[PDB]
Write a protein that binds this ligand. Structure first.
Ligand code: SF4
Ligand code: SF4
Ligand code: SF4
Ligand code: SF4
Ligand code: SF4
Ligand code: FES
Lengths: 180, 240, 166, 127, 127, 384, 196
């Protein structure tokens, strides 16, 4: 079938002159779906109360047992949770974490929910244990990103855009489809 | 010894045996709240119900296996549909007014109520019908919460299911009556006029309470029941 | 001469080595497929300087541990690190490689940094192709002397430069 | 109907009175428990004004003498309730429009509640 | 299985191991440097289990920079083991409580567990 | 020349070591040596909950994972008697055929690149990218997706999923036909693959070569047809076959298989009707998230289900399925506990590999790479 | 059709016939009759040998005859010369102190690798095999991983300041013999099956 060599050349030529299909990350923001599995965030009620009542259910649903939840007793004067319990220490080992979504599934107060950031490559093992104040929705960026924004003076630019945030991510601020 | 039959099994068992022990010794199972090891059984939770025949002579009403003596040649049925439906119903009645505190409850996984609920509750009703858990869509019972009875023990009067274990123990084991109910009806609740909790053996109720009512303040809000690393050992504070 | 010993020359060669990162994959598991996908016509690590792909280790400076590192492979992969030219870098890709991951058992190395000096860790399962690009850019700025840890320290250009091989 | 709304609003109002008494007689008040439908609401939206469902006035020994509760957001036969522990005393208030907060047919004003809590303090409180 | 050396005395453990090792050829031996906390080696402590296949040798937790003179002792130790022709070096990460009790389990269980959990390690991390 | 083809070199995908007994340009015999990927799913699964293991099941065959997901789910269902809604079964076959398209894309891409031209890797893989995005819509993950459940699927599909599926279903037929036009009318590939890779069915069966390269030898045995499990009985199905087992017939049979999978996807999409998403049996399904603030039994059951799980009865079970590499199934021994007593996996890639020394017997030395890429091994399945 | 003939041939000699209501069948042959019977099984038309699955019952709640048990999976492909489609398992118990069993390599070449795997994972030696060489575990690994007396060998998960987890003491899951955190388990947590 000697014609097939010429046909192959012809099709590679047609596709040669068709330029477009590719995305130039980081110059172009990656389109992520709303249900994507990303960096965890802790959501707060509209009152501002934290949702985590430190019930250590997200850690049980972990197949690696990568979540450490030390609980503590709320102070009625200036409380942190809505009930009588909160999470004093809430850590996740990103090197142990496998990004299932079972912890979001087991959270009864909706505190732990996977986000969208994937840019969490870092240099040290001990620097890849994300903490509570490293995952609260109020935080903007990942650890190396924020650290570079401080040692650089330039705010954080996320490498993604989403069509919207899901209702489960109430409060999570993200670039939405081109509304901005 | 007396011969008993549980649903497929025949067991020798000494005469003074309770039907509940004959079921478990026979290898079957039955819910258990009111009764406890070393405590006087009294039919209170009405969970231990079985079917009993003593001739086929089926009893009219369900027998309390916690306070039933056993007779020679008795048939014990714990798998009949009536028994399973009744046990699930009693679980429904017991959880009726419970405070919705499991995730933040110090009792967590080692709570007998949780385990017997997931064991016997919600009988198989006959479709893939959308099931309803609870019929109680009314206002639940709310009483005083997180009250420290003593520098070691904290009290949640909502979690109490009105078993008798702490008061039964308090009269029986130490011989120190520093706990009993106050009112009656559904308003019944645990209280004391002896506030220091003077008895030197109060802590055991912490372990007996099948709910998280009475919890250990020195071990409140540290870790979850499964999370703690257990080390079985022997205490050398005194020569016993 | 190690890319050092002149204020301009070392920045120049750091520029060159950074944009001349030649990734040598050691494809082990499903991490490796997400690295191969970082070569297709949506997201190609074929711009920063990583187009060419020399399977030989004598020819590439970046070693990407992409997958679970089983113990039976630990020395073999190890020797590929010893048989590399000296200005070489090692990336640990994914959870099974970075830590023991969910496979916390008898079979898997619980941190590939045991056998090879790891430069950058990149969590994820699998780490999104764009995340693997993030880690190679991270390594880019690391070999530029542009990378700091959480504790304030600057990280040296080359890991595997500080070890007494044996 | 919609009276429910004002009831919860009225319920919040009730709490104020309680707190005031705490400062007056120098007696311990404690927030007993918050709403479950506010802790365990994860993404679901929440319009109710306050987050507290059960509170109490405890004496020097910590044992409560006065309890006040409000019905949950989805339950049937909604009400607001008061209870004197150990005294077999229950009060069940509604909110009737125009009248105000009423115990059945009898209005529940601030003075009535103040007197009731003062009587509980003088009589039941152990220390 | 023999046990030489003493806990938290790096030089004593190292000198005793010097004496006990002798002319034993380690071409087929297995070296298990047991520690905790994979990442932080600056404060690390180490036990050692050397399995020749014919007889085993145990050194308690006295090595690593966690002790004065411990870093130079671990460097000397790993250099010695490499000199004697070993190629197979292993590192086991155990819980702190395991480090203590594991040397007090019977030899069969301790050796089986260490062999099952050990990770291949580059002696360059100890040199 | 007892030649030591090392692991990963020269560029032997799917880390594997080969001892090629070789004199000249022929191939006397290849002795394979595996185990460099042994992770221990069969061991780690003995210490993980039934629901947790659905996070361990896709990771063995990381290319065609949804067949593993389905096999495990079906085995546990049969073990404890779950009731699958029909829409769950429809979606399960959709996701199964879709991941099969993605697996086959990767297999033919790697094969053509391994020996031959580097170009045709991209285009097929490009389409794969499109497919992957679909999963991100519904599962939030590229692969290793945790979407299946014991009853059915985790939750319902977004509105935006189906239209993207239709887009891809309409662009795909021309695409697969383009790959087939490039390949089937083989200008040089014919003088490379038509002769090589002998598959006599007698020995192929004696060694148990089930994975789609047996039908290339003229054996009409498909698990979707011979043992209908997930409603494949309810689909119009044509089963591709080969005349004489070689690499050419293998690749062409798999391309026609891709078209047959696209046709099955269309067929299932048409018969799709809204409904529930999983078996509501409270012992098998955690209570819905909205009545966690209303019902006590919900809190207890949510807590218990996600910590303890459920305890299936004491017994053994096994279910067959047809994956991109053959007959697949989990022999599950349960002891009545939260975690399975043992999970043994029939790894189709494990028994498919016994036929390499025979296949590459007497063939050329360069062809040993093509005959291996053409066998379609996923070493995550073999070493396991 | 040939499976019914298998059952009728086995039942006459006193072979137990195991069946679950799910469509799976077991025929347990003693070890004496094992080899010749399964040779006849191949002669009865069993083209395809699916699996060799070994089982170690050390921690099983109920006792079993012997500790190890090896199960072969015999099938006849429907699309071959005369294909019925009859597939079934044969279980043969193997003692803890007698890890012996004849190979079916001579019968099926399929067991060449499969049997090797069970020698790796279990201590079971298959007699008459061309090469019983460790397949999966490293050459210097001591023991057999999938038998219950062989540890899984987990490592602690790591955190910021001395906070560590030992997963075996962290599991809320139970095994069959694990009693649980309450005095007993009954009901659903003693074994649960829905009635379709
Ligand atoms: S997503 Fe991460 S933390 Fe959450 S359960 Fe999975 S592995 Fe564990
Ligand atoms: S994140 Fe949710 S599940 Fe985890 S401890 Fe907090 S409230 Fe519980
Ligand atoms: S006592 Fe038991 S059922 Fe009640 S809240 Fe506590 S754990 Fe839940
Ligand atoms: S407080 Fe606990 S132990 Fe005492 S009666 Fe109530 S449920 Fe029983
Ligand atoms: S980290 Fe995840 S994707 Fe990577 S090898 Fe491990 S299981 Fe596969
Ligand atoms: S168990 Fe007999 S009634 Fe409580």
């Amino acid at each position: 079938t000697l014609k097939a060599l010429a046909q192959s050349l012809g099709i590679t030529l047609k596709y040669l002159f068709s330029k477009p299909v590719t995305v130039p990350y980081p110059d172009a923001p990656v389109a992520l779906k709303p249900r994507f599995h990303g960096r965890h965030v802790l959501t707060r009620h509209p009152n501002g109360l934290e949702k985590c009542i430190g019930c250590s259910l997200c850690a049980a649903a972990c197949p690696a047992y990568a979540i450490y939840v030390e609980p503590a007793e709320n102070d009625p004067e200036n409380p942190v949770s809505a009930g009588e319990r909160y999470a004093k220490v809430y850590e996740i080992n990103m090197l142990r974490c496998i990004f299932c979504g079972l912890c979001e599934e087991a959270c009864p107060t909706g505190a732990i929910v996977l986000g969208y950031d994937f840019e969490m490559a870092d240099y040290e093992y001990s620097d890849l244990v994300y903490g509570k104040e490293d995952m609260l929705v109020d935080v903007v960026g990942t650890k190396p990103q924020r650290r570079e924004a401080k040692r650089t003076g330039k705010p954080v630019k996320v490498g993604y855009v989403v069509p919207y945030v899901r209702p489960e991510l109430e409060g999570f601020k993200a670039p939405t489809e081109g509304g901005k | 010894m007396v011969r008993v039959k549980v649903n497929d099994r025949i067991v020798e068992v000494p005469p003074g045996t309770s039907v509940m022990d004959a079921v478990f010794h026979a290898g079957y199972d039955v819910p258990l709240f009111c009764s406890e090891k070393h405590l006087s059984p009294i039919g209170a939770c009405r969970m231990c119900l079985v079917r009993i025949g003593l001739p086929i002579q089926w009893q009219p009403k369900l027998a309390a296996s916690c306070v039933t003596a056993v007779a020679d040649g008795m048939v014990v049925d714990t798998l009949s549909d009536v028994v399973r439906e009744a046990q699930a119903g009693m679980v429904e009645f017991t959880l009726l007014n419970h405070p919705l505190d499991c995730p933040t409850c110090d009792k967590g996984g080692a709570c007998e109520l949780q385990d017997r609920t997931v064991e016997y509750g919600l009988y198989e009703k006959y479709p893939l019908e959308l099931p309803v858990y609870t019929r109680f869509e009314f206002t639940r019972r709310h009483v005083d919460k997180h009250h420290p009875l003593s520098p070691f023990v904290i009290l949640d009067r909502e979690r109490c299911i009105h078993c008798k274990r702490c008061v039964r123990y308090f009269e029986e084991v130490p011989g120190d009556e520093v706990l009993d109910f106050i009112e009656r009806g559904v308003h019944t609740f645990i209280g004391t006029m002896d506030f220091g909790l003077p008895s030197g053996f109060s802590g055991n109720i912490t372990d007996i309470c099948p709910v998280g009512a009475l919890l250990d303040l020195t071990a409140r809000f540290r870790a979850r029941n499964w999370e703690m690393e257990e080390t079985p050992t022997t205490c050398a504070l005194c020569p016993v | 001469r190690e890319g050092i010993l002149f204020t301009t020359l070392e920045k120049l060669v750091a520029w060159g080595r950074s944009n001349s990162l030649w990734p040598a994959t050691f494809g082990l598991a499903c991490c490796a497929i997400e690295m191969m996908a970082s070569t297709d016509a949506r997201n190609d690590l074929a711009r920063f300087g990583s187009e060419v792909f020399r399977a030989s280790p004598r020819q590439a400076d970046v070693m990407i541990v992409a997958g679970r590192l089983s113990k039976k492979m630990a020395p073999v992969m190890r020797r590929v690190w010893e048989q590399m030219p000296d200005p070489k870098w090692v990336i640990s890709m994914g959870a099974c490689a970075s830590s023991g991951g969910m496979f916390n058992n008898y079979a898997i190395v619980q941190n590939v940094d045991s056998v090879v000096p790891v430069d950058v860790y990149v969590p994820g399962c699998p780490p999104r192709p764009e995340a693997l690009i993030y880690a190679v850019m991270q390594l880019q700025k690391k070999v530029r002397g542009q990378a700091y840890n959480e504790r304030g320290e600057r990280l040296p250009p080359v890991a595997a430069w500080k070890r007494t091989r044996g | 109907a919609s009276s429910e709304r004002e009831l919860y609003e009225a319920w919040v109002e009730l709490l104020s009175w309680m707190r005031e008494y705490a400062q007056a007689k120098g007696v311990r008040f404690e927030k007993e428990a918050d709403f479950p439908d506010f802790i365990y609401r994860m993404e679901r939206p929440y319009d109710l004004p306050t987050t507290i469902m059960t509170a109490s006035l405890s004496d020097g020994l910590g044992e409560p003498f006065l309890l006040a509760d409000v019905s949950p957001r989805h339950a049937k036969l909604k009400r607001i309730g008061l209870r004197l522990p150990r005294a077999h005393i229950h009060l069940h208030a509604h909110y009737e429009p125009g009248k105000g907060l009423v115990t059945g047919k009898i209005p529940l004003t601030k003075e009535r509640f103040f007197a009731l809590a003062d009587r509980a303090r003088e009589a039941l409180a152990f220390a | 299985m023999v046990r030489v050396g003493m806990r938290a005395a790096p030089r004593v453990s190292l000198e005793a191991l010097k004496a006990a090792l002798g002319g034993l050829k380690l071409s087929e031996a297995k070296v298990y440097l047991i520690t905790d906390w994979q990442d932080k080696r600056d404060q690390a402590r180490y036990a050692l289990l050397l399995h020749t296949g014919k007889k085993d040798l145990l050194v308690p937790d006295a090595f690593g920079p966690a002790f004065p003179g411990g870093e130079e002792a671990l460097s000397e130790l790993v250099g010695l083991l490499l000199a004697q022709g070993a190629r197979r070096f292993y590192e086991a990460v155990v819980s702190p409580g395991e480090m203590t009790a594991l040397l007090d389990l019977p030899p069969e269980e301790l050796l089986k567990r260490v062999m099952a959990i050990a990770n291949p390690t580059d002696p360059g991390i100890y040199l | 020349m007892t030649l030591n083809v090392g692991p990963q070199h020269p560029s032997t995908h799917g880390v594997l070591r080969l001892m090629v007994t070789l004199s000249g340009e022929e191939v006397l015999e290849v002795v394979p040596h595996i185990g460099y990927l042994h992770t221990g799913f069969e061991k780690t699964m003995e210490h993980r909950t039934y629901l947790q293991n659905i996070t361990y099941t896709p990771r063995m065959d990381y290319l065609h994972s949804f067949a593993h997901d389905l096999a495990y789910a079906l085995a546990v269902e049969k073990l404890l008697g779950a009731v699958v809604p029909p829409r769950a079964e429809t979606i399960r076959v959709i996701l199964n055929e879709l991941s099969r398209l993605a697996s086959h894309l990767v297999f033919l891409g790697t094969g053509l690149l391994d020996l031959g031209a580097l170009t045709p890797f991209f285009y097929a893989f490009r389409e794969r990218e499109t497919i992957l995005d679909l999963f991100e819509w519904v599962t939030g993950q590229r692969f290793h997706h945790n979407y299946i459940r014991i009853g059915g699927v985790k939750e319902d599909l977004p509105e935006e999923f189906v239209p993207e599926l239709k887009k891809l279903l309409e662009v795909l037929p021309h695409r697969i036909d383009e790959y087939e036009a490039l390949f089937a009318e083989s200008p040089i590939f014919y003088e490379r693959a038509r002769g090589v890779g002998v598959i006599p069915p007698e020995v192929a069966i004696d060694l148990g070569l089930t994975g789609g390269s047996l039908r290339a030898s003229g054996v009409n045995y498909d698990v979707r047809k011979a043992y209908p499990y997930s409603g494949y009985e309810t689909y119009t199905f044509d089963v591709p076959l080969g005349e004489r087992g070689d690499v050419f017939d293998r690749m062409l049979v798999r391309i026609r298989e891709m078209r047959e999978s696209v046709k099955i996807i269309k067929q299932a999409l048409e018969r799709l009707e809204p409904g529930p998403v999983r078996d509501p049996n409270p012992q098998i399904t955690p209570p819905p998230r909205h009545l966690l603030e209303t019902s006590m039994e919900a809190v207890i059951y949510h807590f218990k289900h996600y910590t303890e799980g459920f305890h299936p009865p004491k017994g053994e079970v096994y279910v067959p399925t047809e994956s991109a590499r053959g007959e697949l199934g989990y022999y599950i021994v349960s002891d009545g506990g939260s975690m399975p007593y043992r999970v043994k996996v029939r790894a189709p890639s494990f028994v498919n590999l016994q036929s390499l020394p025979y296949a590459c017997k007497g063939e050329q030395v360069p062809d040993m790479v093509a005959i291996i890429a053409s066998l379609d091994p996923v070493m995550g399945d073999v070493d396991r | 059709m040939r499976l019914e003939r298998v059952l009728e041939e086995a039942r006459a000699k006193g072979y137990p016939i195991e069946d679950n209501g799910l469509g799976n069948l077991w025929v347990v042959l003693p070890r004496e009759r094992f080899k010749e019977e399964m040779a006849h099984y191949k002669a009865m038309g069993f083209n395809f040998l699916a699996d060799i699955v070994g089982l170690d019952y050390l921690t099983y709640p109920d006792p079993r005859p012997e500790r190890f048990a090896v199960v072969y999976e015999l099938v006849s492909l429907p699309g071959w010369k005369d294909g019925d489609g009859s597939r079934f398992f044969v279980r043969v118990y193997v003692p803890e102190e007698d890890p012996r069993l004849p190979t079916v390599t001579d019968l099926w070449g399929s067991a060449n690798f499969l049997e090797r795997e069970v020698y790796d994972l279990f201590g079971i030696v298959f007699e008459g095999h061309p090469d019983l060489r460790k397949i999966l575990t490293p050459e210097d690994l001591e023991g057999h991983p999938l038998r219950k007396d062989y540890p899984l060998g987990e490592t602690p998960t790591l955190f910021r300041e001395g906070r560590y987890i030992i997963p075996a003491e962290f599991r809320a899951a139970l095994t069959g013999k694990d009693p649980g955190l309450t005095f007993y388990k009954g009901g659903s947590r003693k074994g649960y099956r829905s009635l379709w």
